Amino acid sequence: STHYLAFPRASTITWGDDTRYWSWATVDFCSYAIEEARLLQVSWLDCRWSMDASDFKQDIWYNASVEVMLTSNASGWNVPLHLEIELPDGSKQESQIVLAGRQPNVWFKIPIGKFILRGTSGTIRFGFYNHEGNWKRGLNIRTLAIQA
Amino acid sequence: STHYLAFPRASTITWGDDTRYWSWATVDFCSYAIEEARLLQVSWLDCRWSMDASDFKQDIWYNASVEVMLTSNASGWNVPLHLEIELPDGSKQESQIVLAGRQPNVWFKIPIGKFILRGTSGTIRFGFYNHEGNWKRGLNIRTLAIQA
Ligand SMILES: [Pt+2]
Numbered sequence: 627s628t629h630y631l632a633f634p635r636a637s638t639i640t641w642g643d644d645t646r647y648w649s650w651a652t653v654d655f656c657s658y659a660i661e662e663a664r665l666l667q668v669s670w671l672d673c674r675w676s677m678d679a680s681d682f683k684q685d686i687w688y689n690a691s692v693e694v695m696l697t698s699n700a701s702g703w704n705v706p707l708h709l710e711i712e713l714p715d716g717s718k719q720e721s722q723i724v725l726a727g728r729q730p731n732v733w734f735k736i737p738i739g740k741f742i743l744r745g746t747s748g749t750i751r752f753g754f755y756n757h758e759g760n761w762k763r764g765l766n767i768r769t770l771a772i773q774a
Numbered sequence: 775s776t777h778y779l780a781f782p783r784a785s786t787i788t789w790g791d792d793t794r795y796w797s798w799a800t801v802d803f804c805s806y807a808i809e810e811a812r813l814l815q816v817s818w819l820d821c822r823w824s825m826d827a828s829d830f831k832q833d834i835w836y837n838a839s840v841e842v843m844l845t846s847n848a849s850g851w852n853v854p855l856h857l858e859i860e861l862p863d864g865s866k867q868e869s870q871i872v873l874a875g876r877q878p879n880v881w882f883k884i885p886i887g888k889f890i891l892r893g894t895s896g897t898i899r900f901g902f903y904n905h906e907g908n909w910k911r912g913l914n915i916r917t918l919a920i921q922a
Pocket residue numbers: 637673674675692752753754
């Protein structure tokens with residue numbers, strides 16, 4: 627079961643307001659108007675949603691997922707995409723995925739890890755990033771999904 | 775633009791775990807598995823989502839909306855449905871709507887008010903309720919939508 631969807635406008639995306647690096651396109655999602663974040667090109671890819679432990683139930687396993695598409699111009703996905711959940715104590719769930727082997731122009735969902743809240747509140751960060759000196763191009767971001 | 779969708783499983787719904795008063799049905803929403811909350815009957819209708827000011831951007835006008843359906847067995851909607859946003863300082867946005875005049879078996883969206891965050895964090899409550907000694911029956915709840 628899906629408890630929340632968070633759209634990229636709610637994310638902190640480095641360069642997201644820079645038109646030479648990122649685009650925004652309005653589109654319909656099951657009657658709701660959302661904006662997809664479309665990466666043209668960056669060296670510094672960093673996309674981080676912020677929600678609060680208090681937004682969730684305690685002692686329940688949550689999984690997080692981000693739905694993306696590679697464009698026809700997709701490139702530089704040979705480097706590891708770092709996946710992260712940061713809990714309010716600073717502890718993290720850390721992962722890695724290589725996108726170079728994926729087919730373009732189809733939505734797929736990347737899992738970014740599982741968490742549980744024991745002992746209640748504080749920021750919880752949901753992100754992916756790659757900071758290497760190579761160009762990442764042509765990733766479109768639909769939504770963060772949080773399940774339990 | 776829609777920043778978040780919150781599904782009723784994330785809400786605090788009085789009697790929601792009581793099978794004599796409420797039902798849960800799994801259904802598809804633009805590829806995501808959600809559970810609709812279906813009210814059979816209560817006298818005490820109370821449905822309240824909790825998110826944190828920190829989940830939003832400051833100095834930006836947000837509107838909140840809840841998508842519902844009246845069933846074929848819909849009843850007791852002649853009383854005012856109280857709509858509420860409670861900010862972290864305790865201040866509220868308060869509204870009222872009468873559902874008795876609405877057609878059943880079609881999704882519609884109820885606006886529950888607008889807010890802006892000036893001076894940052896704390897619980898923000900999104901709810902509707904009616905506590906009168908009358909039976910409310912046959913309301914299905916899809917999702918809270920938060921826009922800016
Ligand atoms: Pt992200």
